[PDB]
């Protein structure tokens, strides 16, 4: 957590806590193994012209309270999404990742034999 990495954002602390939980659990079985990152195939040639056939849909903006009543109250400045807003925003994803990831056998052996991608 922040005791090791210094001040950061909260998901960094959560990630460090989960990784340390895994390491401690391995240690409690009698064999300490350190945490290591995985190797994936990544694409860096994607540009705006390659996505020029995608239709454009505006983002679901956040409902923010007026600044006249915000300066005096400790009430919430923003509201959570409704179900219609959530569906409208989630239906806009481009599905960038491989659908075959959880059953692909190439990446299994690539990560098993530690081949650089």
């Amino acid at each position: 957590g922040d005791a090791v990495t210094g001040p950061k954002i909260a998901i960094d602390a959560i990630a460090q806590g989960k990784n340390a939980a895994q390491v401690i659990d391995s240690y409690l079985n009698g064999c300490l193994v350190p945490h290591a990152d995985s190797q994936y195939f990544t694409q860096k040639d994607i540009t705006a012209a390659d996505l020029a056939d995608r239709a454009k849909a505006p983002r679901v903006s956040l409902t923010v309270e007026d600044a006249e009543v915000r300066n005096k109250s400790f009430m919430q400045v923003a509201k959570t999404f409704t179900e219609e807003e959530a569906l409208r925003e989630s239906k806009r994803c481009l599905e960038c990742g491989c659908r075959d990831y959880f059953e692909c056998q190439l990446i299994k052996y690539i990560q098993d034999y530690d081949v650089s991608t």
Partner: protein, 117 residues
């Protein structure tokens, strides 16, 4: 009573003398009033809007804290009614102590009868 409606009030002839007056005989009709408030209301933009109990609690605590922070000690007066029970009055005194004020008073008591001096 019958359910949630107060129907009449009678004297207690076993534990006391069993006499009453007009305010004790007929004065409990305000329990059946339809003009009684039901939920806390907060004034925003000059309109009272209903809130939850948690939001009301947070609002009153934070606003008293704001007054204390801006203006210091003894900037809050607690004016009670002598119709409340002893436990209510004790908790009101504790609340006056917690927000750092010594001005606890009542318009009906108005300083006592002077027999204490």
């Amino acid at each position: 009573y019958k359910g949630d409606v107060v129907f009449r009030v009678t004297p207690d002839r076993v534990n006391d003398d069993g006499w009453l007056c007009q305010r004790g005989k007929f004065g409990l009709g305000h329990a059946n009033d339809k003009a009684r408030l039901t939920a806390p209301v907060i004034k925003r933009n000059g309109q009272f809007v209903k809130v939850d109990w948690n939001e009301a609690n947070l609002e009153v605590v934070k606003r008293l804290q704001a007054v204390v922070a801006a203006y210091g000690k003894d900037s809050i007066g607690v004016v009670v009614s002598p119709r409340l029970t002893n436990e209510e009055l004790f908790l009101a005194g504790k609340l006056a102590d917690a927000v750092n004020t010594t001005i606890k008073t009542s318009y009906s008591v108005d300083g006592g009868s002077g027999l204490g001096s």
